[PDB]
Amino acid sequence: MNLTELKNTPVSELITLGENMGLENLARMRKQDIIFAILKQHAKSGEDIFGDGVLEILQDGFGFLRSADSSYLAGPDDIYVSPSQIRRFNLRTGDTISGKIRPPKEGERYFALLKVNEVNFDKPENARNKILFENLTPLHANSRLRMERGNGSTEDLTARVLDLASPIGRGQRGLIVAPPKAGKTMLLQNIAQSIAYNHPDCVLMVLLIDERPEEVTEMQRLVKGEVVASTFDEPASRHVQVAEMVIEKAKRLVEHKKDVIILLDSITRLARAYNTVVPASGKVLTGGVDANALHRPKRFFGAARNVEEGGSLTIIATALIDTGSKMDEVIYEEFKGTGNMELHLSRKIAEKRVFPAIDYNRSGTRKEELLTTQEELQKMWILRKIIHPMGEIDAMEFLINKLAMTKTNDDFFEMMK
Amino acid sequence: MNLTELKNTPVSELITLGENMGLENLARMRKQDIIFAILKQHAKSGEDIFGDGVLEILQDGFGFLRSADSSYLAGPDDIYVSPSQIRRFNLRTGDTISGKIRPPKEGERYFALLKVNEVNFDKPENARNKILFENLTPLHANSRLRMERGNGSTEDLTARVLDLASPIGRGQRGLIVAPPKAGKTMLLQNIAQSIAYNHPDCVLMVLLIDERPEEVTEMQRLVKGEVVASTFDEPASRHVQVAEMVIEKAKRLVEHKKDVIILLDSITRLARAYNTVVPASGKVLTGGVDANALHRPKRFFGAARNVEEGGSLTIIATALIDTGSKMDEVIYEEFKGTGNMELHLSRKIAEKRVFPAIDYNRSGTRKEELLTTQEELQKMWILRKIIHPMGEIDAMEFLINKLAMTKTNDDFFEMMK
Ligand SMILES: Nc1ncnc2c1ncn2[C@@H]1O[C@H](COP(=O)(O)OP(=O)(O)O)[C@@H](O)[C@H]1O
Ligand SMILES: Nc1ncnc2c1ncn2[C@@H]1O[C@H](COP(=O)(O)OP(=O)(O)O)[C@@H](O)[C@H]1O
Ligand code: BEF
Ligand code: BEF
Ligand SMILES: [Mg+2]
Ligand SMILES: [Mg+2]
C-alpha cells in the first residue's frame, strides 16, 4: 500500500477496484478522491498504509509531504507531519520521509505520520549525524562531465561544439546567455539527453518556471529524469515556493554525497517573480528592479558548489537578453559577474538557419585546465587562435564542415596539425 | 419565440407587429423596448419564450446571458441566471445556455431561466462530465492550416508570401510585429478571408479593442465570422470584460474539442488597459509599466495551446512598435520572448508602396518541420539562403516578380532549381 503506486495506476483500474470494494459510484469522482476512498476502505480492515514525499515545513511549525508528480503543489493527499516528530528527528525542509500513514479521523483533513522508516533514502541513524550544507568546503570543478555522445550521431555535433567551447564539470555554475528565438529549447533538450546518456548516475532535475505548458509536457516526455515545472498560469508565489523546494531538496541530496544537476531555464523569470513578490520599499532602481529583489536569486544561483567531502551541485541557468525590457537587461548582467561560464548564442547565426548558433568567440570556461589534459588544452588553444580571426558565421560554418568529416574531435585535432 | 430571431428582424416589421398586437405607440420607442413589449404580450397569452447567450457569472454568485451582437455589453434584455441553477448544473463563465425564459414579474428587471435545454450547443449529459481546460496536455502545432487560396487571384500573393515566410498551424501562438502605417489592416483582412475560405469549419473570432468605429463596422461587414470589438469611446473596464468573456468562451469551446481561432489586433492596447485598471502599488518600472500589469495579458496570450485530446486554440496578436511611447516598447516587447512566431513588417518597404511590406529575413517559425514535408522544408531553406544576402526591398521585389509569373509556389520552387 504505497501512495505513488496508486498514483501511477490508471483511472479505469482504480474505478474497478473501488467498485469491487463496494463504495459510492467512482465514475463521477476524481482520481485523488478515488484513491482516498480506497485507502480509507483498506485501513478500515486493519491493514497499514505507507506513503512518501518531500517535507515542506511551514512557518507555524508543522509541515506536509509534497509529491513530485504535481510539481510540489498543495494537494488534499498531503501527509501531515506534527512538529513533535520534527523536533524529535531534527527534520528540515527537503528531507525525504517514507513511513506508515493513517487516514484522517473525524475532524482531520490530512494523513498523519506514525513511524518514519527511511530518511533521505537512507537509515535515520545516518541522517541524525550529518554536516550541514553551509559548512561544506567549496572547491572548483575537478571531475570532468563529458557531454560527447560518441555514437557518431548527427545530433552529437551540438555536444561536440559545446565540449570544444566550454567543458562542464561537477559543481559548475554557468550561464546560457541567448536572445529569444535562438534555439534554447533544442539546446537544453540536447544537453539533458547527453547528461542522461553519458552520466545516468547523476540526479537530473529540470526546472521550468513561467513557461508554455505544451513545452512542459514536451520536456516531461522527452528527458529521462525528473521534471518540476510551473506554467505562467500560476502566480509568482508558487514559482518562489517551487524554487525553494527544489533548492532545499538539492541541498539535502548533496548533504548525502549525491551529484545533483539542475538545468534552470528561467533565471530571468525567477528574478521577475522575486521582484514581484517582494514588498515595495519606496525605492526603485533603474529598469524597475528593487534593491532587495535580486538577493534571493543571487543566493539560489550561488548555492551551486563542488563539495570536497562528497557530491556536487551543478546549476546551468539560461538568461534572457534583448527582450525589449530594461529590467531583464539589468538582471542578466547583474548576474554576468556571476556564472563561472558564459555560453553566448548569436541571433544573426540563428536567422541563417545554422544550428547550433553558438558564439564560440565569447564562450569559454575559467580554470579549464582542471578538466582537460595538457595536449587537449593546447589543441583547444590552437583551435581558438585559428577561429578568432574569422567571423562568427564563417567560423561556425568552418567548424561544422570540419566536424562533419569525422566522428570524434580527436581526429579533427590530429588533422589540424 | 427566440431572442436572436427578434433581434435580426428590422425595425419596421417589429413596429407593425407591435401595433397589430395592440400596445402603446412603438414608433417613438427603442427596438429593444419594442421586443420587450412584444415578448410580454406574447407571454400574457400563455406561450413560451426561448432565449440564448453566453453566461457571465458575477462576483456575488448570479449571472447574465450576454449577446454577441452587442459585443457582450450590459443590456436590459439580459437573462438572469440564479445561483441555484449554477450550483445545480456546475455552470461557469462562458457556457452557452439556451432554454425557456419568462418576462420579469412585478419587482424584477430581467428575464428568468426556468429550464435549460442545450449547453454549449450539446446535451447537458455530455457537459456535466468534461475535462477542464487547465488539465489538457499541450502540444506543438501538428495540423497544417494552409493559407494559400489557390484560385490564382492577385490578392493571393500575400497569402503565398505568408506561407513561404511563416506557415501557421492549429494551436499556434504568434505575433505580428509592425510599426504604425504599415498595412496591418489589409494584412489582417487578407488573413481572415483566407481562413474563412480555406478552413470554414474553424470558429473564427476577431477581437478589436480600442479601435475606430469605422474600422469596426468595416471588419464586421467584410469577414465571414464573429466580430467582437470595443471602440476607444469605452473605458478600459469594458475592454478587460470583453477580453475575459472572449477568452472564457474560447476555453469552453476548446473543452468541447473545437478549433477556435482568435485574431487579436490590440495586444498593446489590451496591456495598456490592464495597466490602467490595475490599482497603483507605489512602484513604477521603466516606461510607466506596473509590475503586476502584464500578468493578465501574459495569461491571455499563453492561453493559446494545442490539445492532444481534441481541438486547438490559435491566437495571432499584432504588436505595436515605434509608436513614440516607451511603454509600448516595453509592453509590445517583454512579449517578444514569449511567443513562437514573429512576422515583422518594414516601414521602409511600406513607404515605397510595395505591398505586402513583409520583413522576410526576421520572420520564421520554430519547429516548422512538423507542418511541412521534407522537400518543402528543403526548398524553403534554399529560398531563405538565396534571399538572405539580398536587401529587404530587393528581396521583396524579387519575390513579387517571381511569384507574379506563376500561380502556385510549387512551380516557382521547381523553376528555382
Ligand atoms: N539545434 C537546432 N537544430 C535545429 N533547429 C533549432 C536548433 N536549436 C533551435 N532551433 C530552432 O529554433 C527554434 C527556437 O529555439 P529555442 O531553443 O526555443 O530558442 P530559445 O529557447 O532561445 O527561445 C526552434 O523551434 C527550432 O526550430
Ligand atoms: N496589401 C496591401 N496592399 C495595398 N495597400 C496596403 C496593403 N497593406 C496596407 N496597405 C496600405 O497601408 C495603409 C495602412 O495599412 P494598415 O494595415 O492600416 O497598417 P497598420 O495596421 O500597421 O496601421 C492602408 O490604408 C493601405 O492603403
Ligand atoms: F523564446 Be526563447 F525560449 F528565449
Ligand atoms: F496604425 Be496601425 F493600425 F498600427
Ligand atoms: Mg526557450
Ligand atoms: Mg491597424
Side-chain angles (χ1 to χ4, degrees):
Chain A
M1 301 300 299
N2 185 270
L3 221 175
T4 61
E5 296 179 1
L6 272 64
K7 290 296 299 180
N8 296 328
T9 49
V11 185
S12 60
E13 278 185 302
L14 288 180
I15 292 179
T16 305
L17 199 276
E19 292 179 1
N20 287 271
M21 293 305 298
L23 299 179
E24 196 179 354
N25 300 330
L26 312 93
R28 299 178 299 270
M29 289 185 60
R30 296 170 59 257
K31 180 180 178 180
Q32 299 181 359
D33 302 0
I34 289 175
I35 295 181
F36 185 72
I38 290 180
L39 291 181
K40 288 186 60 180
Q41 186 65 23
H42 201 262
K44 288 179 180 180
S45 301
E47 301 281 8
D48 302 330
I49 306 180
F50 299 92
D52 55 76
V54 184
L55 180 60
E56 177 189 347
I57 294 184
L58 276 307
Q59 190 178 2
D60 300 331
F62 61 90
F64 300 93
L65 299 186
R66 287 294 189 269
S67 180
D69 65 331
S70 300
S71 302
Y72 297 151
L73 184 58
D77 299 332
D78 294 0
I79 292 90
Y80 171 79
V81 181
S82 60
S84 60
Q85 299 179 354
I86 299 179
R87 226 182 38 184
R88 197 213 158 78
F89 297 92
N90 292 113
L91 303 180
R92 297 191 303 179
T93 301
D95 296 323
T96 301
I97 302 300
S98 303
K100 183 182 301 180
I101 58 179
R102 63 174 180 86
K105 301 180 182 301
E106 313 187 58
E108 293 177 322
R109 299 176 58 180
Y110 297 89
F111 293 78
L113 181 61
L114 294 318
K115 177 183 178 181
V116 47
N117 302 330
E118 192 175 17
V119 180
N120 295 299
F121 307 96
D122 199 1
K123 302 179 181 180
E125 287 74 15
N126 301 21
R128 54 183 294 183
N129 182 22
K130 62 184 302 180
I131 303 180
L132 304 183
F133 182 79
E134 299 81 9
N135 304 329
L136 304 177
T137 62
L139 275 186
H140 297 271
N142 301 331
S143 181
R144 171 63 183 274
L145 295 181
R146 190 170 305 275
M147 301 289 297
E148 174 177 327
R149 289 294 197 88
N151 50 16
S153 180
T154 175
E155 299 294 335
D156 200 12
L157 299 179
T158 301
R160 292 165 66 179
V161 172
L162 184 139
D163 294 330
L164 295 184
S166 62
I168 303 180
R170 301 189 186 273
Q172 187 68 201
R173 178 177 60 258
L175 278 175
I176 306 299
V177 180
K181 204 181 179 181
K184 304 179 303 300
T185 301
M186 287 297 301
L187 190 141
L188 203 279
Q189 291 180 1
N190 183 269
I191 286 187
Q193 291 181 179
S194 300
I195 290 180
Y197 185 83
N198 301 20
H199 306 272
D201 58 330
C202 300
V203 181
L204 180 58
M205 301 178 61
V206 181
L207 181 59
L208 306 178
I209 296 298
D210 194 72
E211 338 238 323
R212 314 104 132 272
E214 42 265 90
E215 302 177 2
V216 169
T217 185
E218 174 179 27
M219 296 299 301
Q220 187 176 357
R221 298 182 177 181
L222 185 137
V223 307
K224 208 282 181 179
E226 193 185 277
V227 179
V228 182
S230 181
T231 62
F232 53 87
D233 297 325
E234 309 303 85
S237 301
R238 180 176 176 176
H239 302 345
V240 174
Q241 181 62 220
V242 167
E244 290 303 83
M245 292 299 299
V246 168
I247 192 59
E248 287 292 337
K249 181 180 181 180
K251 290 180 180 179
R252 295 302 93 88
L253 289 181
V254 171
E255 284 177 340
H256 288 268
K257 300 180 180 60
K258 296 297 182 178
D259 300 330
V260 185
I261 298 180
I262 299 180
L263 299 183
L264 179 58
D265 204 5
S266 49
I267 174 62
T268 302
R269 307 301 179 179
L270 187 63
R272 283 189 169 187
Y274 274 112
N275 183 87
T276 306
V277 300
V278 57
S281 59
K283 297 176 298 181
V284 180
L285 279 70
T286 301
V289 185
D290 192 6
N292 302 331
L294 299 180
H295 173 249
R296 304 285 295 274
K298 203 70 167 298
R299 297 192 61 179
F300 178 81
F301 203 13
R305 62 183 61 178
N306 183 21
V307 183
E308 184 179 2
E309 291 77 9
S312 59
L313 180 59
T314 302
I315 294 181
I316 301 300
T318 73
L320 284 311
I321 64 172
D322 304 329
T323 60
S325 180
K326 299 175 297 299
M327 177 172 56
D328 303 338
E329 179 70 290
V330 173
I331 293 170
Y332 137 72
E333 219 159 87
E334 120 82 26
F335 284 158
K336 181 179 181 180
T338 328
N340 29 90
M341 168 181 296
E342 293 78 11
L343 185 61
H344 299 271
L345 306 187
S346 179
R347 179 184 294 183
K348 181 182 301 179
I349 308 179
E351 292 180 358
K352 207 181 181 181
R353 301 303 178 182
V354 182
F355 291 87
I358 302 180
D359 197 331
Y360 196 91
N361 297 330
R362 303 207 302 179
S363 300
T365 302
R366 303 187 181 187
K367 300 300 180 180
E368 58 181 356
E369 65 280 354
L370 300 181
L371 300 177
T372 57
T373 62
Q374 180 180 0
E375 57 279 356
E376 182 179 4
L377 180 59
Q378 180 180 0
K379 293 168 179 179
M380 290 181 177
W381 181 89
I382 295 180
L383 182 58
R384 282 187 169 270
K385 291 305 177 182
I386 294 179
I387 285 181
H388 181 269
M390 300 181 301
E392 300 180 0
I393 303 179
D394 301 330
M396 289 308 299
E397 293 179 359
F398 168 81
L399 182 59
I400 292 181
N401 295 17
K402 289 303 178 300
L403 294 184
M405 299 298 299
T406 176
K407 297 183 179 181
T408 61
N409 307 12
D410 192 9
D411 301 330
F412 163 76
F413 279 159
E414 192 71 18
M415 291 299 300
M416 284 302 300
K417 300 183 301 179
Chain B
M1 301 300 299
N2 185 270
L3 221 175
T4 61
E5 296 179 1
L6 272 63
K7 290 296 298 180
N8 296 328
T9 49
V11 184
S12 60
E13 278 185 302
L14 288 180
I15 292 179
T16 305
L17 199 276
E19 292 179 1
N20 287 271
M21 293 305 298
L23 300 179
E24 196 180 354
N25 300 330
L26 312 93
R28 299 178 299 270
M29 289 185 60
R30 296 170 59 257
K31 180 180 178 179
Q32 299 181 0
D33 302 0
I34 289 175
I35 294 181
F36 185 72
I38 290 180
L39 291 181
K40 289 186 60 180
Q41 186 65 24
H42 201 262
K44 288 179 180 180
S45 301
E47 300 281 8
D48 302 330
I49 306 180
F50 299 92
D52 54 76
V54 184
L55 180 60
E56 176 189 347
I57 294 185
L58 276 307
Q59 190 178 2
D60 300 331
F62 61 90
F64 300 94
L65 300 185
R66 287 294 189 269
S67 180
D69 65 330
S70 300
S71 302
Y72 297 151
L73 184 58
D77 299 332
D78 294 0
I79 293 90
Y80 171 79
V81 181
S82 60
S84 60
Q85 299 179 354
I86 299 179
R87 226 182 38 184
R88 197 213 158 79
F89 297 93
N90 292 113
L91 303 180
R92 297 191 303 179
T93 301
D95 296 323
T96 300
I97 302 300
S98 303
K100 183 182 301 180
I101 58 179
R102 62 174 180 86
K105 301 180 182 301
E106 313 187 58
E108 293 177 322
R109 299 176 58 180
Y110 297 89
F111 293 78
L113 181 60
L114 294 318
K115 177 183 178 181
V116 47
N117 302 330
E118 192 175 17
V119 180
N120 295 299
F121 307 96
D122 199 1
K123 302 180 181 180
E125 288 74 16
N126 301 21
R128 54 183 294 182
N129 182 22
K130 62 184 301 180
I131 303 180
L132 304 183
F133 182 79
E134 299 81 9
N135 304 329
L136 304 177
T137 61
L139 275 187
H140 297 272
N142 301 331
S143 180
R144 171 63 183 273
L145 295 181
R146 191 170 305 275
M147 301 289 297
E148 174 177 327
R149 289 295 197 88
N151 50 16
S153 180
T154 175
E155 299 294 336
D156 200 12
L157 299 179
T158 301
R160 292 166 67 179
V161 173
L162 184 139
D163 294 330
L164 295 184
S166 62
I168 303 179
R170 301 189 186 274
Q172 187 68 201
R173 178 177 60 258
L175 278 175
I176 306 299
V177 181
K181 204 181 179 181
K184 304 179 303 300
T185 301
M186 287 297 301
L187 190 141
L188 203 279
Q189 291 180 1
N190 183 269
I191 286 187
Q193 291 181 179
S194 300
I195 290 181
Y197 185 83
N198 302 20
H199 306 272
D201 58 330
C202 300
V203 181
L204 180 58
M205 301 178 61
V206 181
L207 180 59
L208 306 178
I209 296 297
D210 194 72
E211 293 288 67
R212 301 175 178 88
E214 42 265 89
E215 302 177 2
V216 169
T217 185
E218 174 179 27
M219 296 299 300
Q220 187 176 358
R221 298 182 177 181
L222 185 137
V223 307
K224 209 282 181 179
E226 194 185 277
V227 179
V228 182
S230 181
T231 62
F232 53 87
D233 297 325
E234 309 303 85
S237 301
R238 180 176 176 176
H239 302 346
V240 174
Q241 181 62 220
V242 167
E244 289 303 83
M245 292 299 299
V246 168
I247 192 59
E248 287 292 337
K249 181 180 181 180
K251 290 180 180 179
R252 295 302 93 88
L253 289 181
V254 171
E255 284 177 340
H256 288 268
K257 301 180 180 60
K258 296 297 182 178
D259 300 330
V260 185
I261 298 180
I262 299 180
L263 299 183
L264 179 58
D265 204 5
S266 49
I267 174 62
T268 302
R269 306 301 179 180
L270 188 63
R272 283 190 169 187
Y274 274 112
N275 183 87
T276 306
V277 300
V278 57
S281 59
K283 297 176 298 181
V284 180
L285 280 71
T286 301
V289 185
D290 192 6
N292 302 331
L294 300 180
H295 173 249
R296 304 285 295 274
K298 203 69 167 299
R299 297 192 61 179
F300 178 81
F301 203 13
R305 62 183 61 178
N306 184 21
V307 183
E308 184 179 2
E309 291 77 9
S312 59
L313 180 59
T314 302
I315 294 181
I316 301 300
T318 73
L320 284 311
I321 64 172
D322 304 329
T323 60
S325 179
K326 299 175 298 299
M327 177 172 56
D328 303 338
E329 179 70 290
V330 185
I331 272 192
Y332 121 79
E333 242 141 9
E334 117 86 56
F335 284 158
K336 181 179 181 179
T338 305
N340 51 26
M341 169 181 296
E342 293 78 11
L343 186 61
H344 299 271
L345 306 187
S346 179
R347 179 184 294 183
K348 181 182 300 179
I349 308 179
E351 291 180 358
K352 207 181 181 180
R353 301 303 177 181
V354 182
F355 291 87
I358 302 180
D359 197 331
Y360 196 91
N361 297 330
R362 303 207 302 179
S363 300
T365 302
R366 304 187 181 187
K367 301 300 179 180
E368 57 180 356
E369 65 280 355
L370 300 181
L371 301 177
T372 57
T373 61
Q374 180 180 359
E375 57 279 356
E376 182 179 4
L377 180 59
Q378 180 180 0
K379 293 168 180 179
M380 290 182 177
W381 181 89
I382 295 179
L383 182 58
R384 282 187 169 271
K385 291 305 177 182
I386 294 179
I387 285 181
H388 181 269
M390 300 181 301
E392 300 180 0
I393 303 179
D394 301 330
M396 289 308 299
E397 293 179 359
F398 168 81
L399 182 59
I400 292 181
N401 295 17
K402 289 303 178 300
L403 294 184
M405 299 298 299
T406 176
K407 297 183 179 180
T408 60
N409 307 13
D410 192 9
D411 301 330
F412 163 76
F413 279 159
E414 192 71 18
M415 291 299 300
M416 284 302 300
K417 300 184 301 179

Short mmCIF file of all heavy atoms in Angstrom, two decimals, chain A residues 141-162:
data_model
loop_
_atom_site.label_atom_id
_atom_site.label_comp_id
_atom_site.label_asym_id
_atom_site.label_seq_id
_atom_site.Cartn_x
_atom_site.Cartn_y
_atom_site.Cartn_z
N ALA A 141 35.62 22.89 -10.11
CA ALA A 141 35.24 21.68 -10.84
C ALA A 141 36.45 20.79 -11.07
O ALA A 141 37.40 21.18 -11.76
CB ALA A 141 34.59 22.05 -12.17
N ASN A 142 36.42 19.59 -10.49
CA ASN A 142 37.51 18.63 -10.61
C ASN A 142 37.17 17.50 -11.57
O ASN A 142 37.92 17.22 -12.50
CB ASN A 142 37.88 18.07 -9.23
CG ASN A 142 38.29 19.16 -8.25
OD1 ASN A 142 38.82 20.19 -8.65
ND2 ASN A 142 38.05 18.92 -6.97
N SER A 143 36.04 16.83 -11.36
CA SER A 143 35.63 15.74 -12.23
C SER A 143 35.10 16.27 -13.55
O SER A 143 34.37 17.27 -13.59
CB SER A 143 34.57 14.87 -11.55
OG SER A 143 34.18 13.79 -12.38
N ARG A 144 35.46 15.60 -14.64
CA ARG A 144 35.04 16.01 -15.97
C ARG A 144 33.72 15.35 -16.33
O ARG A 144 33.61 14.11 -16.32
CB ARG A 144 36.11 15.66 -17.00
CG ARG A 144 35.68 15.87 -18.44
CD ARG A 144 35.37 17.32 -18.73
NE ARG A 144 34.88 17.51 -20.10
CZ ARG A 144 35.67 17.69 -21.15
NH1 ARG A 144 36.99 17.71 -21.01
NH2 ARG A 144 35.14 17.85 -22.36
N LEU A 145 32.71 16.16 -16.65
CA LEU A 145 31.41 15.66 -17.11
C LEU A 145 31.35 15.84 -18.62
O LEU A 145 30.83 16.83 -19.15
CB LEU A 145 30.27 16.38 -16.40
CG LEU A 145 30.15 16.15 -14.90
CD1 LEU A 145 28.96 16.91 -14.33
CD2 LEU A 145 30.05 14.66 -14.59
N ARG A 146 31.90 14.86 -19.34
CA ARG A 146 31.94 14.93 -20.79
C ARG A 146 30.54 14.79 -21.38
O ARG A 146 29.77 13.92 -20.97
CB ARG A 146 32.86 13.84 -21.34
CG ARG A 146 33.17 13.97 -22.82
CD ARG A 146 34.28 13.02 -23.24
NE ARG A 146 35.48 13.19 -22.42
CZ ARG A 146 36.43 14.09 -22.67
NH1 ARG A 146 36.32 14.90 -23.71
NH2 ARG A 146 37.48 14.17 -21.87
N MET A 147 30.22 15.66 -22.33
CA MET A 147 28.90 15.71 -22.94
C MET A 147 28.84 15.02 -24.30
O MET A 147 27.75 14.89 -24.86
CB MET A 147 28.44 17.16 -23.09
CG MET A 147 28.35 17.93 -21.78
SD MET A 147 26.98 17.38 -20.74
CE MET A 147 25.59 17.82 -21.78
N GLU A 148 29.98 14.57 -24.83
CA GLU A 148 30.01 13.95 -26.14
C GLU A 148 29.36 12.57 -26.09
O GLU A 148 29.67 11.76 -25.21
CB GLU A 148 31.45 13.83 -26.64
CG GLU A 148 31.60 13.06 -27.93
CD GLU A 148 33.03 13.03 -28.44
OE1 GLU A 148 33.76 14.03 -28.22
OE2 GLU A 148 33.43 12.02 -29.05
N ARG A 149 28.45 12.31 -27.03
CA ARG A 149 27.78 11.02 -27.09
C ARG A 149 28.77 9.91 -27.46
O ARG A 149 28.93 8.94 -26.71
CB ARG A 149 26.64 11.07 -28.11
CG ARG A 149 25.45 11.90 -27.67
CD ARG A 149 24.76 11.29 -26.47
NE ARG A 149 23.42 11.83 -26.28
CZ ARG A 149 22.32 11.34 -26.85
NH1 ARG A 149 22.41 10.29 -27.65
NH2 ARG A 149 21.14 11.89 -26.62
N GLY A 150 29.44 10.05 -28.60
CA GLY A 150 30.35 9.04 -29.08
C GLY A 150 29.75 8.03 -30.03
O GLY A 150 30.48 7.19 -30.56
N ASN A 151 28.44 8.09 -30.27
CA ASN A 151 27.77 7.16 -31.17
C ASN A 151 27.82 7.60 -32.62
O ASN A 151 27.28 6.90 -33.49
CB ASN A 151 26.31 6.96 -30.73
CG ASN A 151 25.59 8.28 -30.50
OD1 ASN A 151 26.05 9.34 -30.92
ND2 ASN A 151 24.45 8.22 -29.81
N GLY A 152 28.44 8.74 -32.92
CA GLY A 152 28.52 9.21 -34.29
C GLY A 152 27.22 9.72 -34.86
O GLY A 152 27.06 9.73 -36.08
N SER A 153 26.28 10.12 -34.01
CA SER A 153 25.00 10.63 -34.48
C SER A 153 25.14 12.06 -34.99
O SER A 153 26.08 12.78 -34.63
CB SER A 153 23.96 10.57 -33.37
OG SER A 153 22.71 11.07 -33.81
N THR A 154 24.20 12.46 -35.84
CA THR A 154 24.22 13.82 -36.38
C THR A 154 23.91 14.86 -35.31
O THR A 154 24.34 16.01 -35.43
CB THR A 154 23.24 13.94 -37.55
OG1 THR A 154 23.19 15.30 -37.99
CG2 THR A 154 21.85 13.49 -37.13
N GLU A 155 23.16 14.47 -34.27
CA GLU A 155 22.86 15.40 -33.19
C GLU A 155 24.03 15.59 -32.24
O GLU A 155 24.00 16.51 -31.42
CB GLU A 155 21.62 14.93 -32.43
CG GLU A 155 20.36 14.83 -33.27
CD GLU A 155 19.88 16.19 -33.76
OE1 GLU A 155 20.20 17.21 -33.11
OE2 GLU A 155 19.18 16.23 -34.79
N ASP A 156 25.05 14.73 -32.33
CA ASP A 156 26.22 14.85 -31.46
C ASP A 156 27.08 16.06 -31.80
O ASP A 156 27.99 16.38 -31.04
CB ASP A 156 27.06 13.57 -31.55
CG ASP A 156 28.00 13.41 -30.37
OD1 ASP A 156 27.85 14.15 -29.38
OD2 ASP A 156 28.90 12.54 -30.44
N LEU A 157 26.81 16.73 -32.93
CA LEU A 157 27.59 17.91 -33.30
C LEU A 157 27.43 19.01 -32.26
O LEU A 157 28.39 19.72 -31.94
CB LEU A 157 27.17 18.40 -34.68
CG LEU A 157 27.36 17.43 -35.84
CD1 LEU A 157 26.89 18.05 -37.15
CD2 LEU A 157 28.81 16.99 -35.94
N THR A 158 26.21 19.18 -31.73
CA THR A 158 25.99 20.20 -30.70
C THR A 158 26.81 19.90 -29.45
O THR A 158 27.44 20.80 -28.89
CB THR A 158 24.50 20.28 -30.37
OG1 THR A 158 23.76 20.61 -31.54
CG2 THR A 158 24.26 21.34 -29.30
N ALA A 159 26.81 18.64 -29.01
CA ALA A 159 27.59 18.27 -27.83
C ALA A 159 29.08 18.44 -28.08
O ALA A 159 29.83 18.86 -27.19
CB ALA A 159 27.27 16.84 -27.42
N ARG A 160 29.54 18.12 -29.30
CA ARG A 160 30.96 18.29 -29.62
C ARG A 160 31.35 19.77 -29.60
O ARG A 160 32.41 20.13 -29.07
CB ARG A 160 31.26 17.67 -30.98
CG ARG A 160 31.14 16.15 -31.00
CD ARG A 160 31.10 15.60 -32.42
NE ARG A 160 32.36 15.81 -33.13
CZ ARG A 160 32.58 15.41 -34.38
NH1 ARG A 160 31.63 14.77 -35.05
NH2 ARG A 160 33.75 15.63 -34.95
N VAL A 161 30.50 20.63 -30.17
CA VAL A 161 30.79 22.06 -30.15
C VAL A 161 30.76 22.60 -28.72
O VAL A 161 31.57 23.45 -28.35
CB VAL A 161 29.79 22.82 -31.06
CG1 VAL A 161 29.96 24.32 -30.91
CG2 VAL A 161 29.99 22.40 -32.51
N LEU A 162 29.84 22.09 -27.90
CA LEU A 162 29.78 22.52 -26.51
C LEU A 162 31.04 22.10 -25.75
O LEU A 162 31.56 22.87 -24.93
CB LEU A 162 28.53 21.95 -25.84
CG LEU A 162 28.24 22.37 -24.40
CD1 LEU A 162 26.76 22.64 -24.21
CD2 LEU A 162 28.72 21.31 -23.41
#
